[PDB]
Ligand binder design. Structure first.
Ligand code: RET
Ligand code: PLM
Ligand code: PLM
Length: 370
């Protein structure tokens, strides 16, 4: 009353949770780090994703419908970083307090919300593609089509949102956390309403995808055993340059799938630790969930949205191709060599004169036109 005080942790527009109050304040330096640190991720991430969008949307050698996913992901993880990063969290941090609106805090999360599920759920979609290009027997393969793709996207979106929109209507809720500088979902209060949402969040916005992801990269792994007989047995029926077109086109997609695995490898590790912390604080030793118990790990997890680019930039071919032509200075520590792209190119050579036995071909692979 007339210049209100209580402690550091007091935040005028947001109802802190008692738990975050029962501790003593973190030092002036962690906040700044927490600032500086998540500033770096605003940059890096809105960098990569931006580029990534920019390349994959312009570079002609990449208009493959399957990639519109890459786009989507580059997109999600961008937004995320944009918002989740600067300006909100970094300032809250530089000023040990969350300057922005209550709704500011409500959104900050929702965003991350959508865009956490987006990235993850999306990988699934990709993984679906790889299965249609590698797990199913050579004979039955279906490459991605501008149509299917765009539907999936939309399935994704609706979804991504659905499971994070809950809190925006009181089922669960978003407030401050850790050092009260960022914002996040409510995993403390164990009432019937909050707890109910929380579990859907885990099963629906997270496991739900994982099941699918795993379901593929197994069905694929196991169907490779079979591939060597198919790449050797239909390696008899062909010329010396159509076999390379078959192995090169089978040696490449492979990589794409290998890459996306290393991503899901990425996503899985950065979120789960915090994720674990979450459930704990929702089911076990709440006394444990100390400041660092939530904040130090929620960082690694927000960070999860800025690796893909770096990862790609050390392993995707066609990409590096485009990097180097407009932005080589980035590949400064992982330079390009004309070699890598050969494997691909030979996938797109044409047909008049080579392979025509007395058992003529017509394959079934997305060529319908009105
Ligand atoms: C930094 C602010 C954050 C991370 C706010 C919100 C996060 C979510 C809605 C997260 C949902 C999930 C994550 C991060 C990992 C496990 C699965 C999940 C759906 C509970
Ligand atoms: C070759 O080694 C490429 C990586 C070079 C590492 C240099 C970057 C270190 C992290 C600094 C982050 C940007 C700082 C922005 C200016 C303060
Ligand atoms: C080609 O150069 C590909 C890019 C290589 C990545 C450069 C690494 C800089 C990333 C900064 C983050 C590392 C800080 C250490 C914290 C674990």
């Amino acid at each position: 009353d007339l210049r209100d005080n209580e402690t550091w942790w007091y935040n005028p527009s947001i109802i802190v949770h008692p738990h975050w109050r029962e501790f003593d304040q973190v030092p002036d330096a962690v906040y700044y780090s927490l600032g500086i640190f998540i500033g770096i991720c605003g940059i890096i991430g809105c960098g990569g994703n931006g580029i990534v969008i920019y390349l994959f949307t312009k570079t002609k050698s990449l208009q493959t419908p399957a990639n519109m996913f890459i786009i989507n992901l580059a997109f999600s993880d961008f937004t995320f970083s944009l918002v989740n990063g600067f300006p909100l969290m970094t300032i809250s941090c530089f000023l040990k307090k969350w300057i922005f609106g209550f709704a500011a805090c409500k959104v900050y999360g929702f965003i991350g919300g959508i865009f956490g599920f987006m990235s993850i759920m999306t990988m699934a979609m990709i993984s679906i593609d790889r299965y249609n290009v590698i797990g199913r027997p050579m004979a039955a393969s279906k490459k991605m089509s501008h149509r299917r793709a765009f539907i999936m996207i939309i399935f994704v979106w609706l979804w991504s949102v659905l499971w994070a929109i809950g809190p925006i209507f009181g089922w669960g809720a978003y407030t401050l956390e850790g050092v009260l500088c960022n914002c996040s979902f409510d995993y403390i209060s164990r009432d019937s309403t909050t707890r109910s949402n929380i579990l859907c969040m885990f099963i629906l916005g997270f496991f739900g995808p994982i099941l699918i992801i795993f379901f593929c990269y197994f069905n694929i792994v196991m169907s490779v055993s079979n591939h060597e007989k198919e790449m050797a047995a239909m390696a008899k029926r062909l010329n010396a340059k159509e076999l390379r077109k078959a192995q090169a086109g089978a040696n490449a997609e492979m990589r794409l799938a290998k890459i996306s695995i290393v991503i899901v490898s990425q996503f899985l590790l950065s979120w789960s630790p915090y994720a674990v912390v979450a459930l704990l604080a929702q089911f076990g030793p709440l006394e444990w969930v100390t400041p660092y118990a939530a904040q130090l790990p929620v960082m690694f997890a927000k960070a999860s949205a800025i690796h893909n680019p770096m990862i790609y930039s050390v392993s995707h071919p066609k990409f590096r191709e485009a990097i180097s032509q407009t932005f080589p200075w980035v590949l400064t520590c992982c330079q390009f060599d004309d070699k890598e792209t050969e494997d691909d190119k030979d996938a797109e050579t044409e047909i008049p004169a080579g392979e025509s036995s007395d058992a003529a071909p017509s394959a079934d692979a997305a060529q319908m036109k009105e």
